[PDB]
Amino acid sequence: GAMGSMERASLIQKAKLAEQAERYEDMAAFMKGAVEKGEELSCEERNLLSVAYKNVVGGQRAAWRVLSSIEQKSNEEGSEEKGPEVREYREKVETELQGVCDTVLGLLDSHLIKEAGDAESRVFYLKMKGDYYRYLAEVATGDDKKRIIDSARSAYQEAMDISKKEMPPTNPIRLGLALNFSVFHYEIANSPEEAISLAKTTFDEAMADLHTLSEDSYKDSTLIMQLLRDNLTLWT
Amino acid sequence: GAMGSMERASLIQKAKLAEQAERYEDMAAFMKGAVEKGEELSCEERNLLSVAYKNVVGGQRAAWRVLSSIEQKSNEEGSEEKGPEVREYREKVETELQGVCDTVLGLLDSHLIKEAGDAESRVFYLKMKGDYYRYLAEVATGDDKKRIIDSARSAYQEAMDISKKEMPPTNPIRLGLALNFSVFHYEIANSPEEAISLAKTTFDEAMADLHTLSEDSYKDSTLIMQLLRDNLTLWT
Amino acid sequence: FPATV
Amino acid sequence: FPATV
Ligand SMILES: C=CC(C)(C)OC[C@H]1O[C@H](O[C@@H]2C3=C([C@H](C)CNC(C)=O)C[C@H](O)[C@]3(C)/C=C3/[C@@H](COC)CC[C@H]3[C@@H](C)[C@H]2O)[C@H](O)[C@@H](O)[C@@H]1O
Ligand SMILES: C=CC(C)(C)OC[C@H]1O[C@H](O[C@@H]2C3=C([C@H](C)CNC(C)=O)C[C@H](O)[C@]3(C)/C=C3/[C@@H](COC)CC[C@H]3[C@@H](C)[C@H]2O)[C@H](O)[C@@H](O)[C@@H]1O
Ligand SMILES: [Mg+2]
Ligand SMILES: [Mg+2]
Ligand SMILES: [Mg+2]
Ligand SMILES: [Mg+2]
Ligand SMILES: [Mg+2]
Ligand SMILES: [Mg+2]
Numbered sequence: 287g288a289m290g291s292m293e294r295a296s297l298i299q300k301a302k303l304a305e306q307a308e309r310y311e312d313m314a315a316f317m318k319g320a321v322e323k324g325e326e327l328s329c330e331e332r333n334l335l336s337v338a339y340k341n342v343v344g345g346q347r348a349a350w351r352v353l354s355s356i357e358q359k360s361n362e363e364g365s366e367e368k369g370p371e372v373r374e375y376r377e378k379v380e381t382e383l384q385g386v387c388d389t390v391l392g393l394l395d396s397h398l399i400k401e402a403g404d405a406e407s408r409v410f411y412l413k414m415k416g417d418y419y420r421y422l423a424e425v426a427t428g429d430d431k432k433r434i435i436d437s438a439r440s441a442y443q444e445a446m447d448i449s450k451k452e453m454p455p456t457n458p459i460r461l462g463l464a465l466n467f468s469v470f471h472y473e474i475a476n477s478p479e480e481a482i483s484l485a486k487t488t489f490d491e492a493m494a495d496l497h498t499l500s501e502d503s504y505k506d507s508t509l510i511m512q513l514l515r516d517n518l519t520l521w522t
Numbered sequence: 523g524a525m526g527s528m529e530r531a532s533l534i535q536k537a538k539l540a541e542q543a544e545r546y547e548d549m550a551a552f553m554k555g556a557v558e559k560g561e562e563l564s565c566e567e568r569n570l571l572s573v574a575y576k577n578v579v580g581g582q583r584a585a586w587r588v589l590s591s592i593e594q595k596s597n598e599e600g601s602e603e604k605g606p607e608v609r610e611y612r613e614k615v616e617t618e619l620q621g622v623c624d625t626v627l628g629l630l631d632s633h634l635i636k637e638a639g640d641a642e643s644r645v646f647y648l649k650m651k652g653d654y655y656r657y658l659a660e661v662a663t664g665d666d667k668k669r670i671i672d673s674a675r676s677a678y679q680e681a682m683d684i685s686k687k688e689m690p691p692t693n694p695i696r697l698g699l700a701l702n703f704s705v706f707h708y709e710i711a712n713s714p715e716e717a718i719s720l721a722k723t724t725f726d727e728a729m730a731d732l733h734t735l736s737e738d739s740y741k742d743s744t745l746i747m748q749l750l751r752d753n754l755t756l757w758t
Numbered sequence: 759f760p761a762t763v
Numbered sequence: 764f765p766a767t768v
Contacts, residue, residue, distance in 0.1 A: 299607045303592065307585035309615070349543035356539065371535045379545070417762070462763040469760045513761040520760055653767070698768040705765045749766040756765055 289319025297323075301334045310345075313338035314386075321393050326401055332410050339390045339414075343421055346383040350425060353379060380425050387418045394418075405452030406459060412445035413463045416470065423474050435474055442467040455488070455495040458506040464488040465514055472521065482521055489514045525555025533559075537570045546581075549574035550622075557629050562637055568646050575626045575650075579657055582619040586661060589615060616661050623654045630654075641688030642695060648681035649699045652706065659710050671710055678703040691724070691731040694742040700724040701750055708757065718757055725750045 289297060297320040304313035317335040321327065327335060353376040359365060360372055394415050402408040419438035426434050446467060449460040464484055472481035492511055499507055525533060533556040540549035553571040557563065563571060589612040595601060596608055630651050638644040655674035662670050682703060685696040700720055708717035728747055735743055 296605070296607050299604070300611050303589060303608065303611050306592070307588040307615070309585050312611075312614075349545050352543040353539060356542070368535070369532070371532050372539065375536050375539050375548075378548075379543070466762045469762050472760060510763055513763060517760045702767045705767050708765060746768055749768060753765045 287319060287322060289315065289322065292319060294320055294323045294325065298331060298334070301338065305334065305337065310338055310341035314342050318389065318393060321398065324397070326407070327398070329406065332407065335393075336410070336414060339386065340417075343383060343386050343390075343418070346379060346386065347421060347424065350376065350379050350383060383425065384422060387422050390418045391415065405448055409445045409449045409453065409459050409463060412441050412448070413459065413466065416442035416445065416463075417466060420466070420470050420474055438470060439475065442470060454498060455491040456499045456503070456507045458503055458510060461488065461492060461507055461510040461514070465510055465517070468514070468517065472517075478521065482518065485514045485518050485521075489518070523555060523558060525551065525558065528555060530556055530559045530561065534567060534570070537574065541570065541573065546574055546577035550578050554625065554629060557634065560633070562643070563634070565642065568643065571629075572646070572650060575622065576653075579619060579622050579626075579654070582615060582622065583657060583660065586612065586615050586619060619661065620658060623658050626654045627651065641684055645681045645685045645689065645695050645699060648677050648684070649695065649702065652678035652681065652699075653702060656702070656706050656710055674706060675711065678706060690734060691727040692735045692739070692743045694739055694746060697724065697728060697743055697746040697750070701746055701753070704750070704753065708753075714757065718754065721750045721754050721757075725754070 292300075297316045301313050301316040301320065304310070304316060313334065317331075317338050320331065321335065353372065357372045357376050360368055394411050399408070399411045399415065402411050416438045419434055419441060423431065423434045423438055442463065445463050449457070449463055453460040455461075465488070468481045468484040468488070470481075471477040471484065489511060492507065492514075528536075533552045537549050537552040537556065540546070540552060549570065553567075553574050556567065557571065589608065593608045593612050596604055630647050635644070635647045635651065638647050652674045655670055655677060659667065659670045659674055678699065681699050685693070685699055689696040691697075701724070704717045704720040704724070706717075707713040707720065725747060728743065728750075
């Protein structure tokens with residue numbers, strides 16, 4: 287790969303520069319190169335990996351949503367035949383999005399998840415695995431959709447099981463996993479009651495644990511708790 | 523080129539979709555493909571071309587500025603030796619930026635400017651030529667810098683001469699040309715007095731012409747007039 | 759859309 | 764930075 291000749295430490299340094307410059311594609315490429323050096327990622331490095339790909343796919347998802355909305359309007363009664371272009375361009379963005387998801391999932395499967403034994407790292411990577419399968423599920427229409435949904439649920443569930451055993455309720459990774467799995471239930475899996483139940487129990491159990499939360503993690507965990515409350519307000 | 527098999531009308535349609543999706547790289551590639559069909563661009567199509575590349579290079583410039591600032595701090599007294607990475611990554615972004623500028627300038631030179639006879643189109647493309655040479659000037663440090671600055675000034679000057687002869691003072695293209703050439707004088711060419719004089723005369727002459735301005739162009743021209751006033755407030 | 763992190 | 768269009 288194009289990053290094979292660069293030192294691991296230089297790749298991490300440049301991922302940090304790319305983040306500051308909001309160059310998320312470059313950030314992701316640097317972090318993929320770092321992962322491919324074959325050493326486990328530290329806690330800070332895991333965050334660089336996740337932020338890079340979250341931002342790349344986030345932009346692709348936003349664009350896909352705009353184009354899918356145009357396409358759906360184009361297929362309603364009274365809409366004028368505008369030819370294949372909207373579908374073609376939506377398919378182009380979709381295929382690029384799928385490619386990025388596949389790249390992330392490949393990194394996770396080789397070999398980040400296999401070698402992650404500490405709960406932080408294992409839950410973190412399984413959450414990512416659930417997230418990228420969820421993004422594939424958002425665009426899946428074919429025979430593939432149910433299997434993709436099942437793959438997302440299986441990753442999120444393994445992460446949930448570990449997080450409940452090994453992390454406190456206010457751990458930010460545990461909270462963010464529960465936030466995203468609740469969104470999976472609501473938006474992907476047609477299980478709004480499960481989504482609401484998960485968000486409420488997560489929020490309530492985190493409140494009761496706030497008295498043990500570190501000042502260093504207060505900001506991250508309270509932000510995620512606010513996002514859980516925002517979703518519950520949207521949903522009820 | 524990759525767009526050679528696509529119909530011109532389909533390229534224009536997809537450039538409009540890309541704009542709505544904020545996919546400016548795709549937008550630019552679609553518009554480059556359209557230009558390479560060999561027909562002149564309409565007024566609407568010129569705007570799609572300009573917006574696409576302005577946004578691509580705008581993001582590159584923002585990233586270059588972040589990295590150049592880090593690099594300059596890294597070279598001040600008391601800064602710690604962090605190795606070649608900041609320079610390398612700034613050079614990477616710079617080379618990509620230069621490549622996009624070169625692509626735009628090549629499109630303009632082949633054959634948009636040669637075939638543009640109406641004042642709107644000719645001034646529009648010469649303004650773009652000045653803009654992309656100015657962006658090359660922002661990053662130029664080598665022997666090349668003075669020639670690049672001269673190329674920007676020559677394009678802006680030809681555009682200015684045509685715009686004063688052939689367009690009313692409140693024409694948005696005429697106004698935007700003067701705005702950008704004034705910024706060239708202030709930020710690139712070390713001529714703040716010329717920048718101020720140009721911005722003030724442009725603004726004053728446009729005010730006196732507002733009574734002929736169309737309702738369709740009022741928003742564009744008054745916006746640009748406000749930008750001229752903003753720059754004059756910054757500069758005086 | 760609902761919020762994720 | 765100053766404004767351009
Ligand atoms: C070093 C520079 C950068 C900009 C890369 O660091 C980003 C942030 O990395 C930490 O945060 C983490 C985190 C978020 C916080 C909620 C952001 N916090 C605030 C107040 O906005 C959102 C991110 O996507 C990230 C990495 C992802 C997860 C997800 C990751 O699932 C795979 C789970 C929850 C959250 C955890 C890991 C947070 O610990 C720090 O603690 C923060 O200071 C820091 O900004
Ligand atoms: C069709 C959809 C899109 C989004 C592509 O159309 C964008 C806008 O194209 C027109 O505007 C033009 C223009 C700007 C206006 C100032 C935006 N106006 C407001 C109120 O924000 C900024 C752009 O960069 C652009 C193309 C560039 C130039 C530069 C172009 O130098 C090469 C000179 C001045 C200005 C002229 C051409 C404006 O005529 C319309 O008239 C506007 O409605 C419309 O938004
Ligand atoms: Mg080494
Ligand atoms: Mg598809
Ligand atoms: Mg339960
Ligand atoms: Mg044809
Ligand atoms: Mg260089
Ligand atoms: Mg003069």
